[model samples]
Structure formats: structure tokens, C-alpha cells
Target: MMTVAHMWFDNQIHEADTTTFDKRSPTWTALSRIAGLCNRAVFKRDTAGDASESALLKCIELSCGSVRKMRDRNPKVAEISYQLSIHEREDNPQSHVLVMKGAPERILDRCSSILVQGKEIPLDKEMQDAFQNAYLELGGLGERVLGFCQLNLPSGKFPRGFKFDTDELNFPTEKLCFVGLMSMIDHHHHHH
Candidate 1:
């Protein structure tokens, strides 16, 4: 049965192929939009110097590594790539790494960084609900993109026959997409 995840993935491919969005970075645009949604869910809180910020930093580090590897391979054109890494724990076995490349070099110039407000508020039920919504939305988007990369990109472009990492935070590799899109947006922001 085709899931919403499948549909979203196919729609992105369709949109990209047909030029529904800018041909320069449609996948990045779509994926980053989802990331923005995720960010909105938690970014309002004060997270500086707190565990939340620490988690965010870890996420950013992983994202940067993924982006650097992808950029190394496809320096000119935007492309997606993947790798296999060992899991953090022996019990986990392996990790799947997704890379998004081909973003404009100037993409980072336009966007502001996520600012920490202060001490984080406890995640109350409302905040928890918002985060859960963001998480689920990102999860679906990530699953779709993962499938897209696995099936469409050239052989060796994405890892195959690997089990998906169980970490919810790693479910969506869209932060890489978000970085690429921000760069593209930055380009447009300056040129337009």
C-alpha cells in the first residue's frame, strides 16, 4: 500500500521534474519547509546553555558532517548521497547517513541563526504536543525522502540494504536539506 510518505516523495519528484518550484533546489525547498515547521515547534523556548541547546548542538554537528560529505562529492550540482556509519552503541549495530548536496554556495548568507532565548521552560503538555506534531510531520517527510533517495538516485548514491536508524531525531535528514534551502533562499534574498 502506498503511504502518505510515498505520495509526498513522489510529489517532490514530480514537482522537481516538472519545474513546479525553482529547478535549482526543489527538493531542498520542500524538505526545508518541513524543517521550518519542526523548528517552529520548539524554537520559541529559551534553550541556551541547557540540555535542549546541547541536543540541538549535537543535531547541528551531525547535520554539518552530513552536508560536508555531500558537498565533497557533488560540488557543482545539488544532489543527495548516503553513507553507512557504526551506531553509537554496540547494541544498535549501524547507522544510516543521508547527505544532501548541490546547494548554492551562498545559501548561508541570507538566513539568521537560531538564537537561544535563555533558560528553557519545562516541556509542558502544550509544548510536548507541538513537538510531537513536528516530530511526526518530520518523520513522515524523512521517510519519504529516504525512500526517494534509495530508489531514484544512481546506484551507490544512497546506502542500500541497511536498516533505518531507530533514533527519532535522525528520522529526517531534512536539516541537510534545510541548510541547502537556506543557502538557496539566501541567494534569492540577495539577488532579488
Candidate 2:
């Protein structure tokens, strides 16, 4: 696998000059993928936040593709199951970290900050243009872009964890943090 990365650098989203950025700034969020074909990362609510959490967790693991487990009513349709594990930045009873990955266009909506140079740079008008322009430039060049994002549970473990269905009309996707975008891949080019 090749190591290619990019972020909002100097108000522009392009292949980031990795050397200028401190290698250890971003300790939690990261970019990684297998050959598995995956798309949107579902933002869901707490699955009972209990045993059912395990159910959806395990089920989402195997039957991720077309494999639906009757044990739980969650339906997962994917070519290859996508999962990124993070441990270095462990979620304490007070501090928790959440991450999800998918396409850039759809992903950037809920995200207000662009993870750049190890900082959550707010997407002001200039940054928005940076992303839009950079995306077009890459899309113009014919390369697949994958957006990465992370959400942190403010000073606690999943703020409101009550009723979770695992696969819920119960669980919903809320605010997301746009970390960055991957430059190299053979996935979809332009949604248009």
C-alpha cells in the first residue's frame, strides 16, 4: 500500500506537505482501509448501549456485506466489511472518541472542522473553497477520495446513552468532524 495523505494546508486542501506537520499531532484519528468496498459510515445511536452493542458490533463485523444475521434485525449491505480500530486514544469514563469514514461530498456536510496539520481547523468560507476546489482538482484528475472524520464525546463516555436498538430507527447520525481526505484510491470519481 502507498502512503498518500492530504489536509487543509494553508487554506487549501491538497496533498499535504507531511514533513512540515508534526508526525505526532494527530494521536487518535487516522486513515486506513482494506480492499473491501465500503461507502458511507452510518451514524447511529446507542444500541441499548449494552449487550445489543455487542450484537451490532459482532454482526457488523461478519455479515457486514450481504450477510444479515437474524439474531438482530440490523441489515448491512457491503462488499467488504469496513472497520477501523483505535486504542491509543482510549475512551475513558470521562473522555471518549468516535470515528467514521466514507465519501467526501456526503461526509463533509455535518463536519464543520477540517482535520488539518493536527488541528481541527474550522471550515470557514476559505476552507470550504479549499475543499471544493481540491475535490474538483482531484476528481478532475480521476482519483478516488475517501473522507475521514471523528467525533469526541465531550468530557465523558457517550453523553446520553439510554435506549439503543443497535440498528435503530433508534440510533441516528449526528454531528461529525471532518478529519481529512485520502488522495490515492481506485474508488468512485465523481458523483455527478
Candidate 3:
């Protein structure tokens, strides 16, 4: 019984939650002091006339001061300062085209293809149109039908040689159910 008591005491000592300790630390005190200074400055300016301009100027001054201080602390900050001067000069349509072309097959599959200036252009269209196209292309209906066939009816074979049944048309429920059950069991064991 004494050994169990010692074990419990040691566990309690070692496994102490640091969240409350962190909130009462010197770092938190320093942060609160800085925040208090900011609040006081803002409140003082707000009580005075023309608070908006004063507040804006104070913010700009604080930002510039902080940036300068950071730059002094880390010399690498000065190297990246040139990036701030960069401006968009021109737009490239080819870049946009390249991005669209390089998009995932699933994303491109959802888009509508249009012939634009002798080039095939894929643009985002109504989701219904994309779904309709996917349904038709996925053998949702037979060659004679425009709409989806009944789930009970034979919808023909998929490209991967899997026969189209209601079960195959939907997500694999058996695997999902097993996975969900295992996850629940894991959560129960871990937490309780």
C-alpha cells in the first residue's frame, strides 16, 4: 500500500499540467504589460480630438519601429526587404492556361471544355453540367438513355472491368462501417 501511494505521488508530481503555470509566468506578465501600454496609448488618443489620425499614425510608427528592431536583431530581414518593392507589371494568359492544364485530373474533369482561339479551354461551369457529364461518362445510363438508369437495372461495366451495381455506384459502406467501429472502439479505450 505504501509503494502504491509513493507511485501515485511520483506520478502526480511528474505529470503536473503546465497550462496554469504558463499563464502565471514572467513571459505572460511582460506580454500583458506591453498590451496594457498599447491600450493606454489608444485610449488616451481616443479621449483626445482627432483620434483616428493619431491612432493610424501610432500604428504606422509602431509597425516601422518593430520592423527596424527586428531587422537589427536579424540581418537576414534586410535581404528580404527588396521583395516589398515588387509590383505586378503584366498578366500572362499562358500562365493561367498552364495552371489550368497542370491542375489535378479530378479538377479538370469537373470543368467544361471550350475551343478558344484554336485551343481547347477548360473553364469552371455549372456543377450540374459537370455532374451530368460525369454521370453519362461513368455509364450511369445506357447508350440509348439520357438520364441515369435505375440502381436495380444493369448499368453496364466500368472501365476498370467492375460491374455497375448500386453498391459499387456508392461508397464502400462495409469498409467504412468497420473503420468507424474500430475508431469508436479506439476512442473509448484511449479516453475511458
Candidate 4:
């Protein structure tokens, strides 16, 4: 008979939920860190002084920062398909587009260096437009990944071909799942 001690020990050693967080934490941490960085960067700018663009910049900063943290954490994992935020102003409203990818090659290539262009003109309309274009580019890249999955993979292989469905894969990224799933499939293919 299973004693209380045995059951307790079994529970500790074989919890069904063990894989839940284990599977998710790394991706969450990575994406959260990245998106947080962007959000905080924007916040810093907005709160600096009472400039005319202060309130607008502040809102953009907060929203963008949230997205940046989300995008930054995931890197190649949580690609933002498209995002935009609008902030209320006393008269005219302001719009900010948070591009998740296609940041300047220069920015990514030199991860250590601050993006001078992005830093120099965070609120500039031209920069906003550029960011929108960049987001489009990122969306294209994401579509390519989806297309590859759709064309090459058997329909039965995945529950659904490449598609963003959940926050776990949305803001923080899911590299481990991607890698682990692919590795298992590859191993199976290799053996068979």
C-alpha cells in the first residue's frame, strides 16, 4: 500500500506541473528583459523634463518600453508582427510604432553600442516612420519562417503550422520550445 510518506515523496519527485515552468521560464526571462529594456529607455526620455513633448514622449516611452522589453527578451524568437500605440494629448494625439525587429543592422551587429540614431531622435516623425518600415520588414521575415514551415513540414507534423497564438510565445519568446521540439523531430527523423 502507498503510505502517506510515499505519496508525499512521490508528489515532490513527480509533479505533473514540473515541466510547465521549466519549459517556459527561459523564454519568458529573455523576452521580458528585452522588452523591459525598451520600455525603460523610453520612460527615461519622457520623464527627463517638462518639454512640450514630455507627456507624449512619456506615454510612448512607457508603451514602447513594454514592447521593447517583450521583443528584446525574445530576440529572434518573439518577432513582433506589428504594433502601434496612440497617446492622448491636450489637442492633437500622438502615435508611436514599436518595431520589434529590423532595427538597424548597425544596432544589432554592435549590441554593445547604443543606437545613436535611435537615441538622437526618439520622438522624431522620421524615426517613427522608419520604425514602421522596419516593423514591416520584421513581419516579412516572420512570414518567411511561417512559409517555410507550411511548405516543408507535413500537415500532421504540427498541431498548427507556424503561428503566434499565446503570450508565452508572444512577448517573452519560446526558443527552448522551438529548439526542443525541432530536436525531438530531428532525432526521430534521423533514427527512422
Candidate 2 achieves a global lDDT of: 0.42
Between candidates 1 and 3, the lDDT winner: 1
Error of 2 at 86 (Å): 8.7
Clashes of 2: 6
Each prediction's Cα lDDT score?
0.26, 0.42, 0.20, 0.23
> In TM-score terms, which candidate is top?
2
Candidate 2 deviant stretches above 4 angstroms:
1-88, 91-94, 155-165, 169-172, 187-192
Taking every candidate in turn, the Cα RMSD to the unseen true structure, in Å, is 18.8, 12.0, 27.7, 22.8
Off by over 4 Å in 3: 1-118, 127-131, 141-192
Candidate 1 lDDT, tens digit per residue, 1-192?
111111122122222221123334444333322222122112212334333222222233233333223323322212122321211111122222233222122222222221112122333455334433433454445432221111122224323343344353323433222122211000111211
Model 2 Cα lDDT, one tens digit per residue, 38-136? 222221223332232222232233323321222122112212212222111232333434455556777677677766655777767877777788777
Comparing candidate 3 with candidate 4, which one achieves the higher lDDT?
Answer: 4
Winner by lDDT between candidate 4 and candidate 1: 1
Superior by TM-score: candidate 2 or candidate 3: 2
Model 2 TM-score (2 dp): 0.51
Q: Identify the candidate with maximal lDDT.
A: 2
